[PDB]
Ligand binder design. Structure first.
Ligand SMILES: *C/C=C(C)/C=C/C=C(C)/C=C/C1=C(C)CCCC1(C)C
Ligand SMILES: CCCCCCCCCCCCCCCCCCCC
Ligand SMILES: CCCCCCCCCCCCCCCCCCCC
Ligand SMILES: CCCCCCCCCCCCCCCCCCCC
Ligand SMILES: CCCCCCCCCCCCCCCCCCCC
Ligand SMILES: CCCCCCCCCCCCCCCCCCCC
Ligand SMILES: CCCCCCCCCCCCCCCCCCCC
Ligand SMILES: CCCCCCCCCCCCCCCCCCCC
Ligand SMILES: CCCCCCCCCCCCCCCCCCCC
Length: 236
């Protein structure tokens, strides 16, 4: 029997695709509206939504067109993590990019941590999927991942926060907003993992992907816009 939740998530994957495609085009069109020194801010933001767009395009093949639960296949975990592996670092660079051999140590710390977080997650999810339920590898990977994540938040609310003050108001204020994305917006994913780790089922997975879809829109388009307006405001 055809499933309404399945049809719904099929639709939402298109929403992700179109939202990401549209953000991508916005950033690319408004790039020359920027001083030549700020254009990289738009390009990096566009590259991220672009990657997420390709991710959401290929989700169409994971669910399929059937509407049947049992028809759900593909490699949606790999698709999502390859997206995450590329986009999360490209999102984190927006911090030292707004700041300015003086923003490179911060960047280096951000990305090592981020890489530990993402691949930890991948190892854990893959183990959970293969077993069809809780594994301790699934638990410890996660915890290590969360540690990396908390380390990132620490840098943003200390290192980044302090350097922010030495920047012009609209850049400083953007940087301070951006932090909350990583603290609150990014919290959605490890929460979704926790549910997955302790509550198996295809349907709950579809719901997590739904929520991730909104998280992503916020954390990629939203987060990109914030930084883009600062560099346009400071382009006068
Ligand atoms: C655009 C995609 C984004 C912003 C994805 C962010 C992903 C995370 C913040 C992942 C977090 C995880 C942990 C904090 C612990 C280990 C499990 C991970 C992958 C889910
Ligand atoms: C006038 C200033 C010229 C810079 C304009 C924008 C150039 C692009 C900024 C960096 C792009 C990042 C490229 C990442 C490649 C990732 C491959 C994987
Ligand atoms: C600059 C990085 C470009 C990343 C390409 C898009 C990755 C998301 C789609 C992955 C499809 C993987 C199938 C296995
Ligand atoms: C621009 C939108 C492209 C949609 C192509 C859909 C391909 C068939 C899906 C099955
Ligand atoms: C330098 C990062 C190496 C991968 C870390 C994996 C996290 C724990 C997996 C077990
Ligand atoms: C060159 C400076 C490199 C600093 C690397 C900082 C890495 C932080 C470790 C992340 C959390 C580990 C969790 C296990
Ligand atoms: C000013 C920018 C704030 C970004 C927050 C984005 C996430 C809000 C989603 C509601 C709460 C999510 C649960 C955690
Ligand atoms: C953040 C993930 C929350 C998933 C909850 C799923 C509950 C709906 C099951 C139908
Ligand atoms: C069957 C176990 C019930 C508890 C599931 C916990 C899900 C929320 C994790 C946070």
């Amino acid at each position: 029997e055809v499933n309404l939740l399945v049809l719904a998530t099929q639709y939402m994957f298109w929403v992700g695709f179109v939202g990401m495609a549209a953000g991508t085009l916005y950033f690319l069109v408004e790039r020359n509206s920027l001083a030549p020194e700020y254009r990289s801010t738009a390009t990096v933001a566009a590259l991220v939504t672009f990657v997420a767009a390709i991710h959401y395009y290929f989700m169409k093949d994971a669910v399929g067109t059937s509407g049947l639960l049992s028809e759900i296949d593909g490699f949606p975990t790999e698709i999502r993590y390859i997206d995450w592996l590329v986009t999360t670092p490209l999102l984190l660079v927006k911090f030292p990019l707004l700041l300015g051999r003086l923003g490179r140590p911060l960047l280096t710390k951000l990305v090592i941590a981020d890489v530990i977080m993402i691949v930890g997650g991948y190892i854990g999810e893959s183990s959970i999927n293969i077993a069809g339920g809780f594994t301790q590898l699934g638990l410890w990977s996660y915890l290590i991942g969360c540690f990396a994540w908390i380390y990132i938040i620490y840098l943003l609310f200390t290192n980044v926060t302090k350097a922010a003050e030495n920047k012009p108001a609209p850049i400083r204020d953007a940087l301070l907003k951006m932090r909350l994305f990583i603290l609150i917006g990014w919290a959605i994913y490890p929460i979704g993992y926790a549910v997955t780790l302790f509550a198996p089922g295809v349907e709950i997975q579809l719901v997590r992907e739904l929520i991730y879809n909104f998280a992503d829109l916020t954390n990629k388009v939203g987060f990109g816009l914030i930084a883009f307006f600062a560099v346009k405001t400071m382009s006068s």
